[PDB]
Design a protein around this ligand. Structure first.
Ligand code: CL
Ligand code: CL
Ligand code: CL
Ligand code: CL
Lengths: 215, 214
């Protein structure tokens, strides 16, 4: 069912200097990325590593192809035989508010497996061994950075099975670090209401987005 | 397993009692450890300096404990037997029972806390909307600085805020827990870590829960 987040998302699309016909396909690409978590993580990693090409076809929607022309500071997005040109700053802002308003947020206490390839080698070697999945527990969510609170980081996690220790400090991770969700934590209407009001509505009102986008 | 049972037998040699009394305390300790709510009740009675404890949840025979605070000793009645313990040995017996036999919750478990055992200001906002005090287990059996001679059962974050900079986590004893809503993930890696670190290692270093003040 259509909800308040869809309204805020349309408002964010109205900041893009682009045609209504092109706003419509960016809306559909963003909704598709939001529903396919692994697809979005792949795109988030491509933007972070300054890769130039993205192609994904999940089990849900159509194929999404994006060419990131970093030298020209612009981007091409193609969905359903329709091609859209965006500046790089508009591309980052579009994905930022797609992530902010539409990406699922895991419950507290969720156990996840981290992608070893993306973690620093010193952390993998000291806190993990070969053949054991790098498991972690979600401790905090969308945490505000610095005194100015202009960006957030997706998760703060502890390393399983150690948890929070004086020796074992927790780890700030972005969502694309997550390889798998093993078991979700507890969540009820209180959590859903808090997430909607604080991590989406309030952040949107203050232009607070995830740090990986650098708008 | 049998390893943990032998460790519990060995811990009873820290008590200044006859051997016949150790066998009775071993049975009552295993009884308490297997009934978490009953053990939590006795821990709160010890914390509150209360006088009498009775439990009948065992299929065979009730258990009655009398705390004689002025005489600085304790009476444990079981199966029409009576063991007299000093207050210091009573605390030691419970501490090693807790250390070696009490279940330990998985990380990420969501629990409901007893509001009456929490600071009044801390529970006000939950009362104001009629919601229970829910928390998430972040850390377990944490060492208490600077000596690191005793441990605290759990370190928890307030639901649904989680761990923040505006909201600091809370240390709680096991007897704060009113209910377990949903256990976090746990497998053989966790079970081996818990046994090696939080039971075997702590036992060889004489690290017990702070609530017993041994
Ligand atoms: Cl924060
Ligand atoms: Cl800053
Ligand atoms: Cl950690
Ligand atoms: Cl907290």
């Amino acid at each position: 069912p259509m909800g308040e987040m869809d309204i805020l998302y349309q408002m964010s699309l109205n900041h893009l200097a682009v045609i209504e016909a092109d706003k419509e396909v960016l809306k559909q690409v963003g909704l598709s990325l939001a529903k396919q978590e692994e697809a979005f993580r792949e795109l988030q990693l491509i933007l972070f590593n300054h890769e130039h090409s993205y192609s994904h076809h999940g089990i849900l929607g159509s194929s999404i192809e994006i060419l990131l022309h970093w030298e020209q500071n612009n981007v091409e997005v193609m969905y359903l035989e329709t091609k859209v040109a965006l500046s790089m700053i508009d591309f980052r802002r579009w994905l930022a508010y797609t992530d902010l308003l539409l990406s699922p947020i895991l419950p507290l206490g969720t156990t996840i497996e981290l992608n070893k390839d993306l973690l620093p080698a010193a952390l993998v070697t000291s806190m993990n061994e070969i053949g054991m999945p790098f498991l972690a527990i979600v401790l905090g969510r969308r945490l505000l950075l610095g005194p100015e609170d202009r960006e957030y980081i997706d998760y703060l996690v502890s390393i399983y099975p150690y948890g929070l220790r004086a020796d074992v400090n927790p780890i700030y991770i972005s969502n694309f670090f997550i390889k798998k969700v093993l078991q979700e934590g507890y969540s009820d209407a209180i959590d859903e209401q808090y997430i909607e009001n604080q991590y989406r509505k309030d952040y949107f009102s203050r232009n607070i987005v995830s740090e990986i986008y650098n708008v």
